[PDB]
Design a protein around this ligand. Structure first.
Ligand SMILES: O=C1C=Cc2cc(S(=O)(=O)O)cc(S(=O)(=O)O)c2C1NNc1ccc(S(=O)(=O)O)c2ccccc12
Ligand SMILES: O=C1C=Cc2cc(S(=O)(=O)O)cc(S(=O)(=O)O)c2C1NNc1ccc(S(=O)(=O)O)c2ccccc12
Ligand SMILES: FC(F)(F)c1cc(NCc2cn(-c3ccc(Oc4ccccc4)cc3)nn2)ccn1
Ligand SMILES: FC(F)(F)c1cc(NCc2cn(-c3ccc(Oc4ccccc4)cc3)nn2)ccn1
Ligand SMILES: [Mg+2]
Lengths: 211, 208
């Protein structure tokens, strides 16, 4: 419970999003400790009763977890990228099958079983533990991948990466960011104050890109 | 020649009209077909439906002859009669919901996408939103309804929301556009997308 709030935030949440969630927690709760995992292992980690994790902020959806409630905290944007001379830039156009005929570089779990959300499309798949690794193989020409905006922002501008999804969803694949909280927190007014403020600031931050 | 566009009933009317007004700028014959969201993807997959475009909230990755693209967004609410048990507590999990009866859209077949598949094993199927809400008023169950379908009755007080702590403003729902691959070349289509998208975006931000 609040004694030591332990919060897990996956690596697809962007720094701005994280640092915002941090402010509000430290403002409403009074011991806070943070854990980071790739989206692969968010839900796995919180399910081990071992990990005593009170709140978890992740893009991965599991409709109902044992001890945990689900709400939607905000949104974030992810891009299909490849190397500029990759063949899927050759093609002007893409469907989700033009892709599955090529090597996808995909996040993997320590388990090896995958959410519907993080399920690879292709069967030409190759698997990596984190996004830096993923981007290293994409950058070298090995396949395509699905990464957060903030991880490919710089390299897209620089031309060292290309984007295949702008026809699919101009601006980015909008990905909900779920907040899974413990039952203990249901009752807590502080957690409800935290939802209010975080939502409101994440909203401000997110709408603020259109200035 | 005849552009057969399909539009499920979760697409708000302003959304449909925006699509009509934009197709008319680049097409001279255009058929508009409505279907429940539970039957859209089935309808296009039938081979002799000659459906060129389908606008719908239901999702699949790969469909036979069909590209996919995200056209916009829309908002949907878990609703319930106000004196329903659920209203009185606060709802933090979908497990409090699966314990009551759900008034869901039933399928022409019986198979349902992940999105439109009911939650409870306590389910009551219907064929349109009109019906789903007659029941939910009468007190029979809770259900998920397009935002426009419940706007006025949430003001009446006829009807209550259970989603507002889940996702305030409403459960954000993507509206996909599945388009025959004959359309990927044609300038007409791509300017439809560009203008439909621009207009739908102006339309959604206008709520503030
Ligand atoms: O989080 C949101 C919470 C509420 C919200 C409400 C509306 S509301 O106007 O309809 O009430 C709209 C939006 S919106 O910005 O997504 O439309 C939101 C939110 N979206 N926030 C963000 C979008 C994209 C990015 S990104 O850089 O990582 O791609 C963000 C990065 C850091 C922090 C927030 C981001
Ligand atoms: O369609 C959208 C297309 C682009 C878009 C871009 C941003 S962008 O700022 O990130 O670039 C934001 C948004 S947004 O408003 O959803 O954030 C959108 C869109 N959303 N449109 C709508 C939302 C909710 C409702 S409804 O509740 O009455 O059904 C709508 C009803 C009719 C027509 C459009 C609706
Ligand atoms: F990076 C990240 F945040 F961790 C992240 C976010 C995720 N979001 C979930 C999701 C992924 N897709 C999607 C997949 C492929 C695609 O390809 C095309 C299809 C049709 C036309 C053109 C291209 C377009 C969309 N949509 N939603 C998933 C994984 N990883
Ligand atoms: F109306 C409509 F557009 F046709 C439509 C849209 C759909 N969208 C898909 C979807 C539905 N849910 C969702 C389901 C229940 C829910 O209940 C709670 C859970 C936890 C806390 C509180 C309440 C919250 C969210 N999330 N995504 C699906 C079907 N039908
Ligand atoms: Mg949005």
């Amino acid at each position: 419970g609040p004694r030591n709030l332990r919060v897990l935030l996956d690596t697809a949440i962007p720094p701005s999003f994280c640092d915002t969630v941090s402010s509000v927690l430290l403002d409403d709760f009074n011991m806070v400790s943070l854990i980071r995992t790739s989206p692969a292992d968010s839900l796995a980690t919180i399910k081990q009763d071992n990990a005593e994790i009170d709140i978890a902020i992740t893009i991965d959806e599991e409709l109902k977890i044992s001890r945990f409630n689900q709400c939607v905290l905000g949104y974030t944007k992810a891009f299909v990228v490849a190397h500029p001379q990759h063949p899927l830039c050759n093609a002007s156009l893409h469907s989700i099958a033009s892709l599955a005929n090529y090597r996808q570089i995909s996040l993997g779990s320590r388990s090896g079983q995958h959410s519907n959300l993080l399920r690879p499309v292709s069967d030409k798949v190759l698997f990596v533990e984190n996004f830096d690794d993923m981007l290293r193989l994409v950058e070298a020409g090995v396949g395509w991948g699905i990464a957060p905006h903030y991880f490919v922002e710089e390299r897209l501008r620089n031309g060292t990466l290309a984007v295949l999804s702008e026809l699919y969803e101009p601006g980015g694949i909008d990905t909900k960011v779920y907040c899974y909280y413990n039952t203990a927190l249901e009752s807590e007014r502080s957690f409800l104050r935290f939802l209010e403020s975080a939502r409101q600031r994440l909203r401000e931050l997110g709408r603020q890109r259109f200035d």
